[model samples]
Target: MKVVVRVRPENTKEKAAGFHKVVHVVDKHILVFDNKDLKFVFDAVFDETSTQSEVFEHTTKPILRSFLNGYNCTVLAYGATGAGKTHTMLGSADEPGVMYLTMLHLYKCMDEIKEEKICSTAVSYLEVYNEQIRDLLVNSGPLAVREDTQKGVVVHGLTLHQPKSSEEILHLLDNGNKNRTQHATSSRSHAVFQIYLRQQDKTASINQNVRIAKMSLIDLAGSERNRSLLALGNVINALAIPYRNSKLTRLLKDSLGGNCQTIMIAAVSPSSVFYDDTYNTLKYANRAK
Candidate 1:
């Protein structure tokens, strides 16, 4: 859980502002030397020059494959308000995002597993806004977050789509993206894309049970004051030991630093203008490890 910071390239505005890039990086590592002389280690790191294909290959592909082995996993794209988190996590059509690439990997893995194991696939999309859960796949209005003795958290009303093909499942992804609370600046929401794979062992003895696994792709809302996705909870707080100040953090408690195999990609701006935001993001991304 090393805090990996992906420093974004300077845009025209930043360059024109006499911006000097402060982040110097090596593969999966970076240096932010200053008055304190600090360095950070990351499990994986991507540069602005890095392509989406490689980015997906580095994280989402393996994350998706882990589901076939009967385990839960979560991948998050986090950072300051508009630090290319969304632009990086969910890329353009020509270059698909990690979520889009995950579906392709899911379909691929399902086909490669043993024939004796029958696979059934389903997907659920939900948005956590102001700590309230809402179903993005159906017109169920604002849903409720519930919990159980065994289960950590559950949504009261959310439609689950049984996708027969990659085309179908991806279609559901596209539909859910459209339903999010998108605005001129950002999506202004936090989403969890759950891909469920249940496998029945046909070769096992009679009364064999189903092995269920999940891969949750999380697009965390930007961490800002005025346009804060949480203005409260985030990966930083969740990564902090025993911290659950916001309901959003509580919902994602298990994924932040819990049982699920997790990847936390913190996107950061290299410009000095956002120094405070960038400094805080660095601290937030580092706490989990």
Candidate 2:
């Protein structure tokens, strides 16, 4: 399947314009715009209502339903720390947001299909903290964890668990969210670093047998400069420790520059105070594309 990239600009102008516009800032630097007036190539368009949930609902989920039909699907969230990546991926559990709503939609879709029997559906949750991967579901004391090379980046040891129903998935989500590290700095609140979900086929054949579809709902840590983080003081440092780990770094290396079906949702603030960061995030996203 062809790779699809959808851009979401978090600003009033972009919201009004309906598409991102690419702007040349300097000799090398460029500013991205969502306005139709600024000419740039965009595969598909989405406005503010088009969030992670909407992405799955309109783009990713439909693709899975129609084409990959039976193959596994994964939706990953990637961006710098505090970039609203987490909010886009896993919204507040109390209100049942994006990822949660996506799951519900998937269930509804699967239920509508009478022909396809779901062989198995399972979810694994873990986090890479300070380059160490840990299972969030394991309640039996601190589980031994380590990073292993996958493709190229060092990936946390994957922890797989069986989740039969939506309630079970919600329970697992809550447990994992609770375990996720979160701290308050002078400027922001940081969540303990964690990779939220991993999925795979429980009964895929080595040869002709097809495996169950796997959908990964990833909420990546934010990408910020050292200086900005330092300004936040010790509390932000506590949040930064895991993000700085080699494993997360490696993952970003792979996703940013590699051949993975990726989508970047850039949260931009129109305010002048956040101009530098907003521009930096857009640039990073452009490079990833």
TM for every model, in the order presented, reads 0.83, 0.58
Lowest lDDT 10-mer window, candidate 1?
225-234
Clashes of each: 0, 12
Off by over 4 Å in 1: 16-18, 33-37, 148-152, 164-170, 182-188, 205-208, 226-246, 253-258
Candidate 1 residue pairs that clash: none
Across 1-289, the per-residue lDDT of candidate 1 in tens digits comes to: 4345677778877787786565656565654623555687677677768777777777777666566777678777877776777666666566667777778777777778757577778879988766667788887777766765645566677788877665676577777777777674344588778877777776766456554567778788877542234433344564454425555555655555555677777888877677767777777677756
* Alpha carbon lDDT at 7, candidate 2: 36
- Which candidate ranks first by TM-score, i.e. highest? 1
For all candidates in order, the CA lDDT equals 0.69, 0.44
